[PDB]
């Protein structure tokens, strides 16, 4: 029941300590460095709804997903969560709607006020 470990044991990585983003490390990464605001990051990811249905994956595009950290190119939960990861790390994030798609959701797959599950692998990152 893949969501269970993060939902029950996840670390609250939010500043407000509102349990809005919970994290578990599934595979430890290498080194000391975490990516910083402005860095280019390369990830694989998968997202599932609270009902278990997979809604998005970088693997369906057959390429890593690339974005600039902290620029709001991704949901809040990822700008926060990816900034806590080391290179090669795989984590799970459990994200409340305030850190994802909020009351509106996202047509056609993400309902109003959705709590979402992600698995994210940080493949690489490069200075800003």
Swiss-Prot record:
Which stretches make up the PPIase FKBP-type domain? 30-118
User: What tissue specificity does the UniProt entry give?
Assistant: Widely expressed, enriched in testis compared to other tissues.
- What cellular component GO annotations does this protein have? cytoplasm; cytosol; extracellular exosome; membrane; nucleoplasm
Disulphide bonds annotated for this chain are none
A Gene Ontology biological process in which this protein takes part is: response to cocaine
This chain belongs to the protein called Peptidyl-prolyl cis-trans isomerase FKBP5
Q: Where in the cell is it found?
A: Cytoplasm; Nucleus
Shown chain mapped onto the complete sequence: 13 to 140 of 457
Q: What are the inducing conditions? A: By androgen.
- Subunit structure and binding partners: Part of a heteromultimeric cytoplasmic complex with HSP90AA1, HSPA1A/HSPA1B and steroid receptors. Upon ligand binding dissociates from the complex and FKBP4 takes its place. Interacts with functionally mature heterooligomeric progesterone receptor complexes along with HSP90 and TEBP. Interacts with NR3C1. Interacts with Akt/AKT1 and PHLPP1; enhancing dephosphorylation and subsequent activation of Akt/AKT1. Interacts with IFI44L; this interaction modulates the kinase activity of IKBKB and IKBKE. Interacts with IKBKB and IKBKE.
Report the source organism: Homo sapiens
Q: Which UniProt keywords apply?
A: Acetylation, Chaperone, Cytoplasm, Isomerase, Nucleus, Phosphoprotein, Repeat, Rotamase, TPR repeat, Ubl conjugation
What does the record give as the function of this protein?
Immunophilin protein with PPIase and co-chaperone activities. Component of unligated steroid receptors heterocomplexes through interaction with heat-shock protein 90 (HSP90). Plays a role in the intracellular trafficking of heterooligomeric forms of steroid hormone receptors maintaining the complex into the cytoplasm when unliganded. Acts as a regulator of Akt/AKT1 activity by promoting the interaction between Akt/AKT1 and PHLPP1, thereby enhancing dephosphorylation and subsequent activation of Akt/AKT1.
Modification sites for N6-acetyllysine: 16
């Amino acid at each position: 029941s893949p969501t269970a470990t993060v939902a029950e044991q996840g670390e609250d990585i939010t500043s407000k300590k509102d349990r809005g983003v919970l994290k578990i490390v599934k595979r430890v990464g290498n080194g000391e460095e975490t990516p910083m605001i402005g860095d280019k990051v390369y990830v694989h990811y998968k997202g599932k709804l609270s009902n278990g249905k997979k809604f998005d994956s970088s693997h369906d595009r057959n390429e890593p997903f690339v974005f600039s950290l902290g620029k709001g190119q991704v949901i809040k939960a990822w700008d926060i969560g990816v900034a806590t990861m080391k290179k090669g790390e795989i984590c799970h994030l459990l994200c409340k709607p305030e850190y994802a798609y909020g009351s509106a959701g996202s047509l056609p797959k993400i309902p109003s006020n959705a709590t979402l599950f992600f698995e994210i692998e940080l493949l690489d990152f490069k200075g800003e």
